[PDB]
Every structure is written in structure tokens, then in C-alpha cells.
Amino acid sequence: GIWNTLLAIHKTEKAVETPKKVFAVANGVLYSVGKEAPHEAKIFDRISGLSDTSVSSIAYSEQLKSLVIYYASGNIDILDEAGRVTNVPALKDNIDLIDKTLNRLLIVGNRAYLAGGFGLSVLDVAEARIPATYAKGTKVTDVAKLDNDRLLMLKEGQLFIGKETDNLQDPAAWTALSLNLPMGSVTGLGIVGEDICFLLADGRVYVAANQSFEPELLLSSSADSRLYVTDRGLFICAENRIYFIEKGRKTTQFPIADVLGVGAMNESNTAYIALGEEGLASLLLAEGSTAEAMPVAFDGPGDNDFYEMRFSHGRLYAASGLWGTNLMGHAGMVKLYDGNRWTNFDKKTVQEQLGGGFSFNDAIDIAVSNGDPDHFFVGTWGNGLFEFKDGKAIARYSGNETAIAECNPGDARVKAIAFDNKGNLWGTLGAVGKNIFMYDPQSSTWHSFSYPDVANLASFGNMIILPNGDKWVNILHRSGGSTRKGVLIFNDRGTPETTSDDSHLYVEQFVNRLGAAIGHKTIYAMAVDHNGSVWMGSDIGIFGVYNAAGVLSSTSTPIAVRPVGGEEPNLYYVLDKVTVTDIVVDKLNHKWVATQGTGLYLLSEDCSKILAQFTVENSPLLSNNILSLALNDDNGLLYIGTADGLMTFQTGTGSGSASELDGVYVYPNPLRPEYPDGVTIAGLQAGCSVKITDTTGRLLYQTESVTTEVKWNARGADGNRVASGVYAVAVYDPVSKKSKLIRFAVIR
Ligand SMILES: C[As](C)(=O)[O-]
Ligand SMILES: [Ca+2]
Ligand SMILES: [Ca+2]
Ligand SMILES: [Ca+2]
Ligand SMILES: [Ca+2]
Ligand SMILES: [Cl-]
Ligand SMILES: [Zn+2]
Ligand SMILES: [Zn+2]
Ligand SMILES: [Zn+2]
Ligand SMILES: [Zn+2]
Ligand SMILES: [Zn+2]
Ligand SMILES: [Zn+2]
Ligand SMILES: [Zn+2]
Ligand SMILES: [Zn+2]
């Protein structure tokens, strides 16, 4: 399939027991795990039939053999036994309901009670509809169902009782309960047999017979303990131990630390635990039992953070770490994808491999060597330069003896790192004098310099090194209140030890043909196309400098061309005021443009015409806010680093030699009068000639392949559908000199 998601499991924050499966949530990703049988588990995304992206909680209806999926966006999905999804978007669509936070997802029979920042919602699981919302727009701390259709609600430190047979959408229908306990301190409540338990913020746990509600202290857990409600019992998870409360107030203690969720069915003797950063584990509910670990065979990225990505030597290189003026503390993470499996270098791994006092945080740029895929460098914003070699971190460069200059004692912020054609590492440093540096990995020699016009600026962006040796670096920040963010082009002229022979041009602001400013505030992305043009993206859109190699030699300020699109009477600049985060260039010299808030665009050679655009609305794209791009020129897979994780789109730009056109097909075949939209040519390769002819041979439609698909309205010039018969699709790729003749029928 054309779209795919490369999502992370990692921190299991929730767990639910199913008669034959164990559903669990890790960072918003829902997934299944087999019980008695050795796994046969499953990962569930929007591609699997789900209606939304980040899972906020789950619960199972033993009676309806269905799972309720509640999303961070307020959306609801019902996963039936057959694996059929039913959407319940009433909460998400309610604009007035501004807080979607969920506190309790209680499933009683064939009803689900959702208590959150929106109120208390009654979900009809069998019929996917919400017949009522009590306390609408008020945070409801918890919910509990009792005998004789009675419902218990904890809101604003008050406990209310109400009969479901009355109009509980009316405040007068509920009765406020005065109980001997500090109700304002109650963080959770749940029913266990003939009792109701109340957990207090200070750790205490109160128990009360459901027929009297007279509270007495059951146990004294540690402060800020968590309560997990289950049909089998209640779990009081304190720091270092759990309290399992069951019928008749039997309490069992277990030394299980950092527990985020528990799953157990009414008649189960084993509970499934969510240990977060560890994952899943099963526990036999008996005094002398240990939580036996659950296996996670799923391999994915370390996290879903793709701040910066690069594609080299048939591998993806990604940096998760965050950038800002002082937006630090994000755990360091380097992710490498083989095309099948992941390799993750996290904060702890790197610190152990190198040893000592440094923090390995905010990894923000990658630089891969030419010829050695396992030899790459990583720039951390605050912790220095890192050398990776043969699957381990072999060195950390920061401070004295190194050219990695520190802006503060122990603070070296490294961004815009790249390698030259000669195998040297060029890079820039933030908030220091000798800004620009070079490292010879072979001779292990260092050289740093700067140009007064660019020296001591807060932060640079990314570096592109043109074939003639020119180095382009974008300016992300000078200082607090400075608009002097441009681009610096420079050539060291083979001697990184001197500036005396260098050529450089600092272009604070670019101009058009008429000598006016473009108007860009910041340059976020830069790309060299096949026509020797440096296409750059900014806060006000995209624009390219033609013959970029001659800028240092030219006798004028470089001219930037803002692409012009649309028909002759109605023209415009291709995406004005749209913040462009990344640019990648096709085998066809077409441009893949990532934007902050308006999805993904595919533009023509000169960026004049939009060839395609993908958003959350029109495509399986996870988020309209894309942070990075990377393209596998060999199999045509474009990696899309969205704010909500990694995705891949088959561009059809692949260098797949044999059987490349063996996959072309038309659907629907035959084309019946009840199918109005027309036909779709699929399994193509971008850049292909596609022509439709009658059995005679006269062409009726002709195009080039944009993506993997081409569409035909299947009608004549008169707008009425084309006559019955056998039509033919001739596909020719100019590159391989091979053709594909496929036929489809139009029937009465
Ligand atoms: C591993 As190679 C020498 O083909 O870049
Ligand atoms: Ca050398
Ligand atoms: Ca020089
Ligand atoms: Ca989102
Ligand atoms: Ca080809
Ligand atoms: Cl029903
Ligand atoms: Zn119903
Ligand atoms: Zn993160
Ligand atoms: Zn990048
Ligand atoms: Zn290689
Ligand atoms: Zn190597
Ligand atoms: Zn040297
Ligand atoms: Zn200068
Ligand atoms: Zn084109």
C-alpha cells in the first residue's frame, strides 16, 4: 500500500484484558498481544480502520465482545469482535466541550461512562451513540455504578448520587452526599463487591459498605497513589508497591513499582500490568506472586520525534531532540532505519558507551560520511559533537583541545553539520566567536574560524555544500530582538586554517529581478536541484536562486525567483505566508515541500504548478504540521516526519529495474454505468507516458505519471461517458525504454 506509518511502541501507559488478547497503549499507539498462544499480536493505526491518531484510554465490554477506544482529540471508536470500527465523534465535534481530558472510562454491561473535563458522557457501545452528557462542560473527577440503576459522580470535591431512570441532565435530579471523609481530597473511587473505595491524594484509602456509605480507613498507601478500577478488583499503585483489593475487603500487597495501568476480567486470576518504560507484564493475583514480563516483539523508532532526518547509504538517520533559545532537556535520541529494522541510540546507551559527566540531550543534527554508513556525527544543542562508529558512540567533542567552542562552561551547542567531497566534517556552533569549524576525521585535526558579519550569532540552521565547494548556511537566530536572519555563502578555498584567501557573501535579505526584497523573515529549508538552483523555504513561502555556484563570483546581490502559478487571468505566488520546514528534490527534479500547518506539496521543476497536495483531510497523512522529509531515491519511498510521527509515501520515483511496470492495472474493470467517477490507472511509475486508445488506436486521453496513479473521467469532449468497448492503456517509461499495454472494458 502507497501510505504507511512507522510508529513507536516504547512507554506502555495502559493495559486491558480481552478473553483471547491483551490490548495496550504505548505513547498513543494502540496494540494487541496474544495470551495462551505465543503472541500473534497486532499494531492498530488509521490504516487498520481506526478513525483518529492518539489513543488516550481503552476499555472492553465483556458483554458486547467490543473495545471502546477514546482519543486525545475527544474522538471515540468501537472495535467490534470481527475488527470493525464504528466512529462516535459527538465529543470531538462539540466545540463548546473545550477540555477532552479523560479521568475514567467505566464499562458497565452495554454502557460506557466517560468522566472527563467535558463532564460525564453515557456511551451506547452497541449502537455507537451518546444519549446524554451529565455535568456538560464541568470536570468530573470519577464515576461509579451501583445497585438499582444508581450512578455515583465525583465533581468539584462533591459526591453525587442519581438514578439513571431520572433526567440526570438536570442538576436537581442528583443528590449531594455528605460522607465522613475529606471528599475534596478524593482522587479516585471504585466499587469492589458490596463496598465502595475512596482514594485520597495523601495516600489514605477509605472503604464503605455500599448499603450504608459510612467510611472507615482500609489501608494507608503512599501520597499521590493511582487507582485502577477493574471488574476483578481495585489496584492501589503506590511508589514501589501495589495494593490489590478484592471482595470482602481482602487486600494483597505486591512489590511492583511505577504502574500506569492494569487489565483484568471479572472471572480472571491473572492481571496484565503496564510498567511504562519497561512495557507489559502479567501477574497471578496470589500473595506470593511476581509480575512475569510480557514480550514485545514489535520493533519501531525509539520515539515519534523527527526534528531532523537524512537519507544516506540505504538508511534513514533521524534526530529527535528539540531546539529553542533555552528549549533544552529533551532526552537525546538517534534513530537509524535499515528499511526493515530500527537501531536507537538513547540518552542512557550513549552516556554508558562514552562514560562520565555529560547529559546527551537535544540531539538536533546528523552528518553521515561518504562511503562509511556506520560512521556518522551528531550535533547536540548544549552537549557538544558526538562521533558514532560501527553501532556505538566512540567519542564526545566539547571544549578545550577541540574546535567545539563552548558558549557557557560545559555548554557547546552544535547545529548545521555536513561532510565535504574530500571527507571532512564542516559544521557551525551557536553563541561563540569562532562560529564555523572543520574536523578531519582521518588526521584528527581541528580548524575553526568566522566572518565578523556572522560571528557570535545565536543559531545557524542547516548546511548545504554545492559541488564547487561553496557552503550555504541559513540563520535561525542572531539575538533576542534581531531581524538580521539571512543566509551565509562561503568558500574556505582549501585552507580552513586561514580566512585571508576565502570568498564569502552574507545575504541578510534576498532580492527579485527588479531589485526589491523578497520579504522573508527566517529561512528554514534549502535544497539544490539538478538545474544548479538552491530552492529555499521560509515563513512567507518558497523561492529559488538560479546558477547558485556563481553567487560568490557574481557582481550583484543574488536574485531569488518566487514561483508563479495559475491561469493567465488569475495568477499568484506559490504558497504565500505558508511556513516551509523542509524541501526534497525528485529524480524528475520535482519538489516535495513539507509545511507547518498546510500539509505536503509536490511541485513541478520550477515550482510553478502544484502537482499534488496531501493533508489529514484528503489523505492518510498523520498531521498537517511536517517537521522533516527524506527520500529513498532507490525504491521511491518518501519519509515524512510529521509532528505526530513517521510516515512513508510511495513516490513512484524508484530506481526499481525489473518488473517496474509489471504492476500496472485499471479499476474498475469493467466500468459499469452505476460506477460514475470513472477509471483509475494504478501501479505506475512517476514520469511514465500514459495514453488511452480505442480498439482502432485513436488516443482519447494522454498524460505523464505524477505519482503511482493516473485518473480518467472516462467521458468524451461532450461530457457524456465514452461508448462501450475495449479500451487500452499504453504505458511507456522513457528511462528504461520499456512499454506496458494493458486493456479494460466499458460495458452498457
Ligand atoms: C558501504 As558503500 C562503500 O557501498 O557506501
Ligand atoms: Ca586528512
Ligand atoms: Ca582559507
Ligand atoms: Ca495531531
Ligand atoms: Ca523506470
Ligand atoms: Cl443497547
Ligand atoms: Zn442501544
Ligand atoms: Zn519527545
Ligand atoms: Zn533536514
Ligand atoms: Zn553507501
Ligand atoms: Zn565504519
Ligand atoms: Zn589542517
Ligand atoms: Zn561578510
Ligand atoms: Zn515536471
Author numbering: 29 to 776
Task: Please share text taken word for word from the publication where this structure appeared.
The most recently discovered system of protein secretion is T9SS, also called Por secretion system, which operates exclusively in selected species within the Bacteroidetes phylum. T9SS is essential for the secretion of many proteinaceous virulence factors by P. gingivalis, and has, thus, attracted considerable attention as a possible target for pharmaceutical intervention to treat severe periodontal disease and restore homeostasis of the oral microbiome. Here, we discovered a new component of T9SS, PorZ, and found it loosely associated with the P. gingivalis cell surface in a manner independent of A-LPS anchorage. To sum up, the reported full molecular and functional characterization of PorZ, a novel essential surface component of T9SS, contributes to our understanding of protein secretion as part of host-microbiome interactions by dysbiotic members of the human oral cavity.
